[PDB]
């Protein structure tokens, strides 16, 4: 009847975001973050020795691959007959290294390739990478499983003896282009010996070959000094004892 027309009505006031839900979202995001970062830290710590070992292995592989690439580039620049297999640290002379039946000699190109690759491998090993990771060079022998075992063994042994003879025989062309220090290095870094049997190749003719295979120190070796020995200076020229005229 006499009601107040000017009665005011408070506006519908949007109600705010409850503080709990945003704070709780913050807390749960923080907890997720904490668990993630704790996992990262814990995994990094438990595998840190493994990570350091793997980094060392990768560095050794990279250094060895760089040395092999330098050696194969030098071979390509100098003599095409020298082919270097960087996959498994192998030096091959396929065409030059073919061996006929019951003979332990090689043609002229094989001798040229050997006496050309020896100084290159020497100067590669003389570098810091070589002085840090290069061990002595092992001469590879291959024999078949057919016929008399000892005949093949003797053939391979004579092949290895003839190889080192060609490296270190008097009147050889290598001796005319060498110094005493290089000869001593060849004596230190080369040993002759080793036979093997394999069936990864389709032809028995491939077994009649000579191959150079260098091998490197282990990660825990680090060039033990006691293993190294010394040799006296050369007093007389070496003479091969194999029967050249046959």
């Amino acid at each position: 009847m006499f009601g107040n027309a000017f009665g005011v009505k408070k506006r519908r006031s949007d109600e705010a975001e409850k503080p709990f839900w945003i704070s709780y979202a913050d807390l749960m995001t923080a907890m997720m973050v904490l668990f993630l970062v704790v996992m990262v830290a814990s995994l990094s710590s438990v595998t840190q020795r493994i990570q350091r070992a793997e980094q060392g292995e990768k560095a050794r592989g990279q250094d060895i691959s760089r040395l092999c690439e330098r050696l194969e580039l030098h071979a390509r620049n100098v003599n095409k007959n020298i082919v270097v297999d960087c996959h498994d640290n192998r030096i091959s002379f396929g065409e030059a290294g073919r061996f006929a039946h019951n003979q332990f000699f090689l043609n002229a190109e094989g001798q040229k390739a050997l006496q050309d690759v020896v100084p290159l491998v020497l100067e590669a090993s003389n570098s810091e990478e070589g002085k840090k990771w290069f061990k002595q060079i092992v001469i590879e022998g291959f024999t078949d499983t057919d016929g008399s075992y000892l005949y093949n063994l003797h053939l391979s042994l004579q092949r290895s003896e003839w190889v080192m003879c060609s490296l270190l025989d008097s009147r050889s062309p290598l001796q005319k282009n060498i110094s005493a220090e290089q000869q001593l290095q060849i004596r230190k870094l080369f040993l002759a010996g080793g036979v093997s049997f394999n069936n990864a190749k389709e032809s028995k003719e491939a077994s009649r070959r000579v191959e150079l295979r260098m091998q490197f120190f282990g990660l825990k070796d680090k060039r033990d000094k006691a293993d190294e020995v010394d040799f006296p200076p050369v007093v007389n020229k070496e003479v091969c004892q194999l029967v050249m005229p046959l």
């Binding site: 009847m1 006499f2 709990f20 907890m31 814990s42």
Partner: protein, 265 residues
């Protein structure tokens, strides 16, 4: 800068146990404050409203003057005293001339009693609902702050510099997380309890205030303005006919007087 490093060193230097203790103590104090300033106050208000409603219902059959004096003497509390005064102003006394004096025969309502004994004045402001409806959020925030600070302590103590220290570091960090979560869990439990008690108290307060205002409204009848307007309309309609009848009767009396005068002459 270095100032951030310094304050981070200072903050994380406290023992992890002191954070749940601080959270529990402060949340308990806020809960005690809620109990004192809100819950006990609401219980008192509800009980007083029930007592007032019982008092009002007992004068339903009393005379208007007696009812008015009983209600005046009954309402002794600043908010309800002022509310009663304003409501009594809203009441319209109807006077009839009895025994040569103006006596109240009827008191009429012109406003509902809830307009003066309102929820805001009788419940909301006394209970400080504009603050206490936000107390649970404050308690949860205090718990979350304690949890964050305990996480800072635990994370700062986490430093597995060796592969063999990883498991121990993880275990200690999970323990510190447990401390922080303890603080948060206590705070959230207290917040839920406070929400339950507060909302139930509001519901009961509003219900009993409605009973109180309904008791007050039932004492006095509304609608006096329309009755007055109908009375005025009736008076005008009767006044036209009264004027006509008075004129006609005056004419008849004049005719009689002049006829008598002529006979006398």
């Amino acid at each position: 800068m270095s100032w951030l490093n310094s304050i981070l060193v200072t903050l994380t230097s406290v023992e992890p146990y002191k954070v749940p203790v601080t959270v529990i103590v402060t949340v308990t104090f806020a809960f005690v404050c809620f109990i004192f300033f809100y819950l006990l106050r609401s219980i008192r208000i509800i009980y007083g409203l029930k007592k007032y409603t019982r008092s009002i219902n007992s004068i339903e059959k009393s005379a208007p003057e007696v009812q008015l004096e009983h209600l005046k003497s009954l309402f002794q509390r600043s908010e309800l005293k002022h509310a009663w005064n304003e409501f009594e102003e809203s009441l319209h006394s109807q006077y009839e001339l009895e025994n040569g004096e103006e006596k109240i025969v009827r008191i009429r309502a012109t406003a509902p009693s809830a307009s003066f004994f309102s929820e805001q004045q009788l419940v909301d402001i006394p209970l400080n609902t504009e603050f206490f409806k936000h107390l649970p959020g404050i308690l949860t925030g205090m718990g979350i702050i304690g949890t964050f600070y305990g996480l800072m302590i635990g994370l700062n103590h986490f430093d597995p510099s060796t592969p063999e220290q990883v498991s121990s570091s993880v275990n200690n960090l999970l323990r510190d997380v447990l401390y922080a979560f303890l603080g948060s869990a206590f705070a959230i439990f207290a917040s839920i309890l406070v929400t339950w008690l507060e909302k139930l108290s509001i519901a009961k307060s509003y219900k009993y205030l409605e009973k109180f205002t309904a008791a007050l409204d039932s004492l006095y009848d509304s609608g006096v303005g329309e009755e007055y307007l109908a009375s005025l309309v009736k008076s005008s309609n009767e006044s036209a006919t009264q004027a006509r009848h008075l004129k006609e009767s005056l004419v008849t009396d004049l005719r009689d007087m002049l006829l008598h005068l002529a006979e006398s002459q």
